[PDB]
């Protein structure tokens, strides 16, 4: 009436919960790159010679 060893298991199942990968879009930056410093339009000379 006691507990005895039974037949060895024939296989093992290991369960884990996993989600999946999306598409590669690689959206690097809101406003991207190093935007260049640049000329103010027209500007004009702010200096003249004497005479």
């Amino acid at each position: 009436g006691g507990l005895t060893c039974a037949s060895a298991p024939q296989g093992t199942l290991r369960i884990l919960e996993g989600p999946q990968q999306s598409l590669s879009g690689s959206p690097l930056q809101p406003i991207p790159a190093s935007p260049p410093p640049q000329i103010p339009p027209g500007l004009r000379p702010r200096f003249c010679a004497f005479g």
Partner: protein
């Protein structure tokens, strides 16, 4: 005399200072695929990675 010994952090670098629970992490790592230090790694202990979490070895995520 202090060269190379007294450094300074970059502008974006920062020190971590918050303290969190980190108690539901060992139970999540097992859902993800880790097998507890207790047993049944499912491979050979050589094709398995020893998982550690803050000094405490959760144990042997498969390779």
């Amino acid at each position: 005399e202090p060269c190379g010994l007294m450094n300074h952090l970059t502008a974006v670098c920062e020190v971590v200072t918050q303290f969190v629970y980190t108690a539901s992490i060992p139970a999540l790592l097992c859902n993800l695929g880790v097998t507890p230090i207790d047993g049944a790694p499912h491979r050979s202990y050589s094709e398995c990675y020893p998982v550690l979490l803050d000094g405490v070895m959760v144990g042997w995520v498969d390779k």
